[PDB]
Amino acid sequence: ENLYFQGKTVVFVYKDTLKSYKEKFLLKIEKDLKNHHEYYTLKLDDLSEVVEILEENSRICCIVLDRASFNIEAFHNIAHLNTKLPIFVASDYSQSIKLNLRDFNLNINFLQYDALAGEDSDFIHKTITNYFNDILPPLTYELFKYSKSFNSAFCTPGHQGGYGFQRSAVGALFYDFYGENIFKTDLSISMKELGSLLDHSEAHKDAEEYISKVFKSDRSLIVTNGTSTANKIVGMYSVADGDTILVDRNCHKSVTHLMMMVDVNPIYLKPTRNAYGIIGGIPKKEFKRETIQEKIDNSNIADKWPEYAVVTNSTYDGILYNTDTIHRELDVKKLHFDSAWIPYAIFHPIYKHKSAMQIEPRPEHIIFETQSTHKLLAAFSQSSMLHIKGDYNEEVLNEAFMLHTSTSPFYPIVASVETAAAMMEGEQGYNLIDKTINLAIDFRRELIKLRSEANGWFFDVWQPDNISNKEAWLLRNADKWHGFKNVDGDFLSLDPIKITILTPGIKDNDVQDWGVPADVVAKFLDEHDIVVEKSGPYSLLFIFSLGTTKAKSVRLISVLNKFKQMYDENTLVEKMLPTLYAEDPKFYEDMRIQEVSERLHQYMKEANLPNLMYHAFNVLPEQQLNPHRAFQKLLKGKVKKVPLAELYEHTSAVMILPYPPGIPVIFPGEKITEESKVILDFLLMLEKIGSMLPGFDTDIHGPERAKDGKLYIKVID
Amino acid sequence: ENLYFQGKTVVFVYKDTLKSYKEKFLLKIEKDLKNHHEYYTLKLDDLSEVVEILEENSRICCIVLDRASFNIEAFHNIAHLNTKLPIFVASDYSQSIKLNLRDFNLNINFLQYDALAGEDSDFIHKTITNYFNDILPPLTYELFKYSKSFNSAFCTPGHQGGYGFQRSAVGALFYDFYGENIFKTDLSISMKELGSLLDHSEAHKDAEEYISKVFKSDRSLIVTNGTSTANKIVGMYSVADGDTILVDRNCHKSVTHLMMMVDVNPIYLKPTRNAYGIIGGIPKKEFKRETIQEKIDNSNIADKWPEYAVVTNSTYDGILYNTDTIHRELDVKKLHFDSAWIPYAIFHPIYKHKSAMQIEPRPEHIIFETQSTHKLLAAFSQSSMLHIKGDYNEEVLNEAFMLHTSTSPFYPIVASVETAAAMMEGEQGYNLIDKTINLAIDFRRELIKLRSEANGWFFDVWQPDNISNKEAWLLRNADKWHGFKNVDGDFLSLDPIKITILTPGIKDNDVQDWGVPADVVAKFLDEHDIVVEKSGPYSLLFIFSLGTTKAKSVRLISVLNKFKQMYDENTLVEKMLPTLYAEDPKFYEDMRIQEVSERLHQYMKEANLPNLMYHAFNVLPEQQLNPHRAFQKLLKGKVKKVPLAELYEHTSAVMILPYPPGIPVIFPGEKITEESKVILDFLLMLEKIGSMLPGFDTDIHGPERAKDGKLYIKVID
Amino acid sequence: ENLYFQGKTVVFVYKDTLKSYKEKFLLKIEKDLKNHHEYYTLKLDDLSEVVEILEENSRICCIVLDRASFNIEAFHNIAHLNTKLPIFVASDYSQSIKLNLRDFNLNINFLQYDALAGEDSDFIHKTITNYFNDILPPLTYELFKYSKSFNSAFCTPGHQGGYGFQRSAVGALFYDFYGE
């Protein structure tokens, strides 16, 4: 009923050179399907074409085939693509079934050639509208259905289903741009038929339970203000001010944000990295009981054994921890994986024992997985899931949920995250991830195959050498490709779908004589309309998601080796990078691409930046004061602003966040000493290097550029 | 360029009986406007019709009139409706201008009757597409423009502009339902052309500054997780754990939520109310220096004079404080109005000195106004503004902003709140509020005019007797209509647009012999598809917003006196309230509406509920422990669960929230004693009364209904 | 849903010599009602004609009238003929209600002259299909609904929903005569 695809197509596939009366039959119900309830139609010669189309277009919503075109193979493939898809086999009184389908569960019905044709046309339409109703998840379906009502409300939201946008001109332009339905599904608790999110009521409860069942979770919660909010919910549930928490040193901005409002003391788990500035794994040693007890003794406050653990898995650049090996070693009852970058983890075999929800909670221990559903699944931004496992307290976590969830949640986002769960439900999800995985691996192999053919220099991939078999490849001490120190046997895996491209300039995780900085590649990808996830000094991160077709990757390939063409060409910066040229044409007057690149590479070789960034994040500065209490001193006022140089031997009042590499260097309350001088040297270097060449800049969040230009940091008391 | 209204109409208005060659001229450019760039057209007889249409339809985007139809009046009225609206006056070489337009600034150009007609059609199209570009606010326009690009991205969000929803069927149904553009404008910071929200960069800054200028604010911040989040931002900026805060006792759920994670002690400002359970104003006395200093001495913890003040203005039911009179009396430097229910306040004269932003911050004192833009303007849910005033610290509030704002904000919501500012910009906003105000007053006057004619009983309005003049009427001690105690001269105003309907049953703010409970009216409004904002035991709240047409109010009128018709009819509960009847037809077998209603009224008269609710919220229970520390005890575990009866003499661990009236009764950490026995009596009464009649229920958030049904509350230690 | 009169007619009655933009409004939703879900339309000059027609034809299933043509008498008579019959009054931002209707229980909704016309056309269609569902008695409605299912039965009666009449010629003539 009025809820269906945009391009509703029904695929007629009967073998060409049918009988005359069977052709008239299938065409009568084709016209009938068109002229009643506005369908679209394809005609094909065999079912093999349909399975091709289904892997690209999913707005086909029925298959009616003459029995001649019946194919055992296609039905096996259609089975593994869409079990609910309506199928119709038209046959006369002559032929019985193929036995393969006894077991196979498709939505097959059988028509007989006869007088009644428009009857079948109505029969087909019904089983289609059933298919359309029976594919939305509960709350989404409920929400969508409500939209079609006409309610005449005197309540919130104030736009009251769109009527408020119509009164003004700019309102009308906004309304038309975004579409009727987004406003008609913008409801509040004042429309009681859906219940509440914070209450987990009629519709919402059904949605929350659905998601939990889908992700193999004991209990799941939907969050409409990003994983940043989900992380804080977990914390304020697990942690009361006073006890100690175990923190991944390479954690999200939001982890610190949580620490900053509860009087809690962290010990950080020292992770590895390479000269590229790629986040590595926390070695197993750090998780051991003895390492924890010792680090507690050495911390300043350090109440006792941590009640709370937060480890980011996977890393931004796609390294995966074995979650089984971690839980075996971590005797912390509230341990929380920040799995923002792997909501798909639980749906593919290659991630066996690499997602939180895969482990059985140890007796009276609680597991938390926070996932950013929008980050790598199909959902609206700000939409996130909170999966928990084991014995838990609804009475108190509901309050922790209420602490951060708004009282007027935006229902389309609620629907969107539930719908993303329904996308992953069943072997539907497996194929969805399998595609993006196979595509990524193809891009990896296709790029090194180009490196072989390539003359002179060429790009490279941050991956093992042998990637023949399709797995999340395991890092090994032996191989120097990852550039990490002391990695354990069978602990770290590489996520195939996260492709890090490497530009010449890093030999043995240190500086290089000749190179080509990544910044001059990123800009060239930007000139040719390509958006990169992250750009290192010599690396480049592309994330192949379920929204990445092979065509996109061919575009990426073609522009990439074109950059080499135009760089070996040594074309003018004007003709090659017009945006960079336009920033200062006086400076780039007759400059060519090689001059610009080599001058940037020279200044990094002169600054000795790679191993500076190495030793900067490989030391951990003396923690003087609780991040919470450091922020509190900002409020209370006891803090003074002194230049970056004078940060030495003082206690930082705010977080410092340099780009590159886009990683917290120091948290609020920590202090730099002789031991941790490395980080301040790296910072002061970023200043000089960030100025020199126009168009290539540096940023450090936390300090303040004054009138005089000098950058002061606020230090405590 | 490809950004325009849906029904782009251009109004031709030339006086009937034109000249033959002038007729053909205007028609040649009408056809040209239709067949090129797909315009729609109206023809009218005089400009007076146009001003009528413009006040109902704002997708007319040009007016081309023959000079005969020129009207001095209409052009003054069109001026006060849309100055940017393109106007075209076609005239021959015969007539000079009317002088009125010297002052008036319309978008008038002048055409001359001649050969070149299609030229003018192109000239008209340009000045229209200029109008379409020049009405969106900066970030919204920038966001909308980006949608039209084709970027081939390998970044977040994972749906990558919608391409991820296409791979699956349920994805496609979700994608089609909501529309292409909502996904193409779902961006991240990874597309650097817009900058960041938390950074307040190129596009965002322009939007943030625009809003601040629009609402007459020193500095404004946009919030994408509701005012609930905005409130917490304000708090964690203004408050460090240890000092005391001044709280409106009738505050939002979110105010407490803020208190629960900062170690802060509140003193509550006792507000008034009536038997109906309508939230009243805090009397001026409570704000005085002596009342504050005294209540501090009397509190348990009470560090010192509060650094932070939070008062909710307006009330849920539309009572307004004089913000000037408050700031004069409250020597608290960080004072924060929770103006969720009045984002429109600053745009209409009747709210003079009733909004925060209207007062000059006292030297070194900071003012905060948090507004729920979605609550009573045209914006998406979760969208809220944070307006501040005076000397402030960006370096620290940026951290407070970052503490609660997600790292991946949903850009359409960002755009939506900025667009809502642009809707209010200029006298555009004045007329928008003036309409909803005049409509409200009309509904009020027409309803009491119906009460006069009405036979026997009828509804009433919670308003003064004399409402002849169009003002925010001021409450007076003398008049018994508001039922409040000790109201000050010129302190409390009634917001016209918030209509509270009253059903018989409350005589002199106490019980009544005969009545008709509001619940049996709400259900009847629900049966007839009408959504109420809030329902009291004998009241009903309709909020007339800018999304409320007169047709809605006539629908509301017609169903209302129909309820009286069917109640005086004494129709069967089956035929009158089928949903209620269906819940238990065994019980309502042959019951009529009067029996059901009178039995409910009798049980409230027997329970003595109205004055029970009165004395419940008019006492304030002994605060035993900080709300923060009470919640912390849940985490730490020191808490036991005992039934509601046994809450007496114990310290509550969680907030209790009864419906009715939908107001916090006790906060975490407070304790009931003999003095505050009233509230627990009211609670235990709500149990008995909530059971008895089927379909009419009661709810109390905070306790827990067990297996046996009995409701335990968790009490501390 | 697919259960309705044969001649589904919707009576537009707006006073001749309407305003130009109000004429286009009611006609835009008249065409919209025709071309989507196949309605039939009458145009009349006053409501007095409608009460005449209702006492002869009961396949009119909605009345959408401009507020000019509002009539106190006809609404009292329509009340005593069909309380459930959908009524729609289109009016601009100018006029409040006549008090007679306070007591009278019709199926009146109110439209406002504005941009959104096809929206109202969808709003009208919904309140009509509600009227069509809400007039059959329980068992009749249940029986009628079942007919629209496709069940593939192996039970009694032996004709199994008509399929048995199709196999023979005389069967087909009997089936066609009496109807699916």
SS3 string of chain C?
A: CCCCCCCCEEEEECCCCCCHHHHHHHHHHHHHHHHCCCCEEEEECCHHHHHHHHCCCCCEEEEEEEHHHCCHHHHHHHHCCCCCCEEEEEECCCCCCCCHHHHCCCEEEEEECCCCCHHHHHHHHHHHHHHHHCCCCHHHHHHHHHHCCCCCCCCCCCCCCCCCHHHCHHHHHHHHHHCC
Going by the DSSP 8-state scheme, the letter that residue A1 receives in this structure is: -
Going by the DSSP 8-state scheme, the letter that residue A678 receives in this structure is: H
CA dihedral A437, A440, A444, A450 (to 10 degrees): 130
Q: Give backbone dihedrals phi and psi of A633, rounded to 5 degrees, phi first.
A: -70, -30
The string of DSSP letters for A312-358 reads: -SS-TT-EEE-HHHHHHH---SEEEE--TT-TTGGGSGGGTT-SGGG
CA dihedral A644, A649, A652, A655 (to 10 degrees): 70
Would the CB atoms of C101 and B558 count as touching at under 8 Å?
Answer: yes
CA distance A237 to chain B (A): 7
C-alpha closest to that of A135 among A76, A82, A186 = A82
Would the CB atoms of C150 and A126 count as touching at under 8 Å?
Answer: yes
C-alpha closest to that of A622 among A664, A578, A576, A666 = A666
Q: And the tokens for B591?
A: 């019951």
Give CA–CA dist B169/B175, Å, rounded. 10
Give CA–CA dist A167/A160, Å, rounded. 12
C-alpha closest to that of A163 among B137, B530, C115, B80 = C115
Whether the upstream peptide bond of residue B558 has omega within 30° of 0, thus cis, is no
Q: Quick check: A154 and B542 in contact, CB under 8 A?
A: yes
Question: Which H/E stretch holds residue B86?
Answer: strand B86-91
Report the amino acid identity of residue B316.
Y
Give CA–CA dist A482/A494, Å, rounded. 10
Q: Give backbone dihedrals phi and psi of A502, rounded to 5 degrees, phi first.
A: -120, 130
At B400 the three-state DSSP class reads helix
| Three-state SS letters, B290-314 | HHHHHHHHHCCCCCCCCCEEEECCC
Neighbours of chain C (3+ CB pairs under 8 A): A, B
Buried b / exposed e over A350-361, threshold 16 CB at 10 Å, is: bbbebbbbbbeb
Give CA–CA dist A161/A164, Å, rounded. 8
Would the CB atoms of C115 and A150 count as touching at under 8 Å?
Answer: no
Give CA–CA dist A413/A425, Å, rounded. 19
Location of structure tokens 């409570």: B286
Question: Which H/E stretch holds residue A632?
Answer: helix A627-636
Give CA–CA dist A670/A627, Å, rounded. 8
Give CA–CA dist B323/B362, Å, rounded. 13
Contacting residues of C for A123, CB less than 8 Å apart:
150
Percent composition of chain B: helix, strand, coil (DSSP 3-state, to 5): 40, 15, 40
Cα-atom radius of gyration of chain B, to the nearest Å?
A: 29
Handedness of CA B622, B625, B628, B630 (dihedral sign): negative
CA distance B141 to chain A (A): 10
B642 forms beta bridges with B713
Q: How many CA atoms lie within 13 A of A192 on its CB side?
A: 10
Q: Give backbone dihedrals phi and psi of B538, rounded to 5 degrees, phi first.
A: -140, 10
Give CA–CA dist B630/B465, Å, rounded. 46
CA B5 from centre of chain = 26
Contacting residues of B for C109, CB less than 8 Å apart:
555
Ordered alpha helix ranges (H), A36-81: 47-54, 72-79
Give CA–CA dist A437/A447, Å, rounded. 15
Q: A132: Cβ–Cβ under 8 A, 6 or more apart, which residues?
A: A3, A4, A5, A61, B173
Contacting residues of B for A140, CB less than 8 Å apart:
174
C-alpha closest to that of A158 among B381, B410, B422, B541 = B381
- Closest in A115, A119, A166 to C115, CB measured: A166
Would the CB atoms of A58 and B172 count as touching at under 8 Å?
Answer: yes
| A539-543 and A534-535 strand pairing | antiparallel
Q: Quick check: B634 and B683 in contact, CB under 8 A?
A: no
Q: Quick check: B70 and B13 in contact, CB under 8 A?
A: no
Give CA–CA dist B437/B342, Å, rounded. 13
Q: Quick check: A358 and A346 in contact, CB under 8 A?
A: yes
At A636 the three-state DSSP class reads helix
Q: How far lies A455's CA from each of A65, A280, A449, A458, A564, in Å?
A: 53, 32, 12, 8, 10
At B367 the three-state DSSP class reads strand
Q: B245: Cβ–Cβ under 8 A, 6 or more apart, which residues?
A: B239, B259, B264, B265, B266, B267, B306, B307, B308, B309, B310
Resolution of the model in angstroms = 3.4
Instruction: Please state at what angle helix A593-607 crosses helix A550-569, rounded to 10 degrees.
Output: 90
Q: And the tokens for B280?
A: 């009243």
Would the CB atoms of B5 and A173 count as touching at under 8 Å?
Answer: yes
CA distance C61 to chain B (A): 19
Q: B370: Cβ–Cβ under 8 A, 6 or more apart, which residues?
A: B227, B230, B231, B234, B336, B337, B338, B339, B340, B384, B385, B386, B387
| A334-337 and A308-311 strand pairing | parallel
Q: Nearest chain C Cα to A151, which residue? A: C123
CA B316 from centre of chain = 10
Q: Quick check: B59 and B6 in contact, CB under 8 A?
A: yes
C91 forms beta bridges with C112
Whether the upstream peptide bond of residue B314 has omega within 30° of 0, thus cis, is yes
Q: Quick check: B321 and B281 in contact, CB under 8 A?
A: yes
Cα-atom radius of gyration of chain A, to the nearest Å?
A: 29
At A26 the three-state DSSP class reads helix
Q: And the tokens for C141?
A: 């409605």
Q: Burial, B654: exposed, middle or buried (Cβ in 10 Å; 0-12, 13-18, 19+)?
A: buried
Going by the DSSP 8-state scheme, the letter that residue A688 receives in this structure is: H
Would the CB atoms of A155 and B532 count as touching at under 8 Å?
Answer: yes
Would the CB atoms of C126 and A1 count as touching at under 8 Å?
Answer: no
Percent composition of chain A: helix, strand, coil (DSSP 3-state, to 5): 40, 15, 40
Q: Give backbone dihedrals phi and psi of B583, rounded to 5 degrees, phi first.
A: -55, -35
| B539-543 and B534-535 strand pairing | antiparallel
At A525 the three-state DSSP class reads helix
| A60-66 and A9-13 strand pairing | parallel
Would the CB atoms of B562 and C113 count as touching at under 8 Å?
Answer: no
Give CA–CA dist B178/B159, Å, rounded. 14
Longest CA–CA span in chain A (Å) reads 94
B245 forms beta bridges with B266, B308
Q: Quick check: A459 and A539 in contact, CB under 8 A?
A: no
Q: Burial, A605: exposed, middle or buried (Cβ in 10 Å; 0-12, 13-18, 19+)?
A: middle
Q: B586: Cβ–Cβ under 8 A, 6 or more apart, which residues?
A: none
Would the CB atoms of A546 and B169 count as touching at under 8 Å?
Answer: no
Give CA–CA dist A523/B420, Å, rounded. 36
First to last CA, chain C: 18
Contacting residues of C for B42, CB less than 8 Å apart:
20-21, 24
Instruction: Please state at what angle helix A593-607 crosses helix A677-692, rounded to 10 degrees.
Output: 160
Question: Which H/E stretch holds residue B54?
Answer: helix B47-54
The string of DSSP letters for A161-217 reads: TTTTGGGSHHHHHHHHHH-HHHHHT---TTSGGG--TTTT-HHHHHHHHHHHHHTT-
C-alpha closest to that of A6 among B162, B173, B164 = B173
Give CA–CA dist B356/B369, Å, rounded. 6
Q: Give backbone dihedrals phi and psi of B336, rounded to 5 degrees, phi first.
A: -135, 110
Q: And the tokens for C98?
A: 């006549």
Q: And the tokens for B259?
A: 């208190």
Q: Give backbone dihedrals phi and psi of A370, rounded to 5 degrees, phi first.
A: -105, 125
Q: Quick check: A155 and B525 in contact, CB under 8 A?
A: no
Would the CB atoms of C166 and A114 count as touching at under 8 Å?
Answer: yes
Would the CB atoms of B178 and A375 count as touching at under 8 Å?
Answer: no
Q: Give backbone dihedrals phi and psi of B659, rounded to 5 degrees, phi first.
A: -120, 115
Q: And the tokens for A658?
A: 């340099």
Q: Give backbone dihedrals phi and psi of B245, rounded to 5 degrees, phi first.
A: -125, 145
Question: Which H/E stretch holds residue A310?
Answer: strand A308-311
Q: Quick check: B301 and B249 in contact, CB under 8 A?
A: no
Going by the DSSP 8-state scheme, the letter that residue B552 receives in this structure is: H
Instruction: Please state at what angle helix A519-527 crosses helix A550-569, rounded to 10 degrees.
Output: 120
Contacting residues of B for C19, CB less than 8 Å apart:
49
Best of B130, B170, B498 to substitute, by most chain A Cβ atoms within 10 angstroms, is B170
Q: Quick check: A536 and A518 in contact, CB under 8 A?
A: yes
Give CA–CA dist A48/B326, Å, rounded. 77
B13 forms beta bridges with B44, B65
Handedness of CA B565, B568, B571, B577 (dihedral sign): positive
C-alpha closest to that of B512 among B596, B593, B602 = B602
Ordered alpha helix ranges (H), B492-592: 519-527, 550-569, 573-576, 578-583
Q: A645: Cβ–Cβ under 8 A, 6 or more apart, which residues?
A: A680, A684
Going by the DSSP 8-state scheme, the letter that residue B700 receives in this structure is: E
Q: Burial, C59: exposed, middle or buried (Cβ in 10 Å; 0-12, 13-18, 19+)?
A: exposed
Q: Quick check: A409 and B190 in contact, CB under 8 A?
A: no
Q: A331: Cβ–Cβ under 8 A, 6 or more apart, which residues?
A: A289, A305
Neighbours of chain B (3+ CB pairs under 8 A): A, C
Q: Give backbone dihedrals phi and psi of C104, rounded to 5 degrees, phi first.
A: -65, 135
CA distance B20 to chain A (A): 35
**Chain A residues in contact with chain C using a Cβ-Cβ cutoff of 8 Å:** 1, 114-116, 119, 123, 126-127, 148-150, 166, 172
Q: Quick check: B273 and B279 in contact, CB under 8 A?
A: yes
At A656 the three-state DSSP class reads strand
B368 forms beta bridges with B336, B388
Q: Quick check: B200 and B390 in contact, CB under 8 A?
A: no
Give CA–CA dist B119/B337, Å, rounded. 56
CA distance A163 to chain B (A): 5
| B308-311 and B244-248 strand pairing | parallel
Contacting residues of B for C107, CB less than 8 Å apart:
none
- Closest in B551, B554, B565 to C105, CB measured: B565
Question: Which H/E stretch holds residue B543?
Answer: strand B539-543
Give CA–CA dist B64/B29, Å, rounded. 10
Report the amino acid identity of residue A672.
I
Q: And the tokens for C45?
A: 């000059």
- Closest in A257, A410, A654 to B403, CB measured: A257
Give CA–CA dist B629/B668, Å, rounded. 9
Give CA–CA dist A288/B694, Å, rounded. 59
Longest CA–CA span in chain B (Å) reads 94
First to last CA, chain B: 67
At B278 the three-state DSSP class reads coil
Whether the upstream peptide bond of residue B361 has omega within 30° of 0, thus cis, is no
The string of DSSP letters for B621-655 reads: --B-S-HHHHHHHHHH--EEEEESGGGTTSBBSS-
| Three-state SS letters, A445-471 | HHHHHHHHHCCCCCCEECCCCCCCCCC
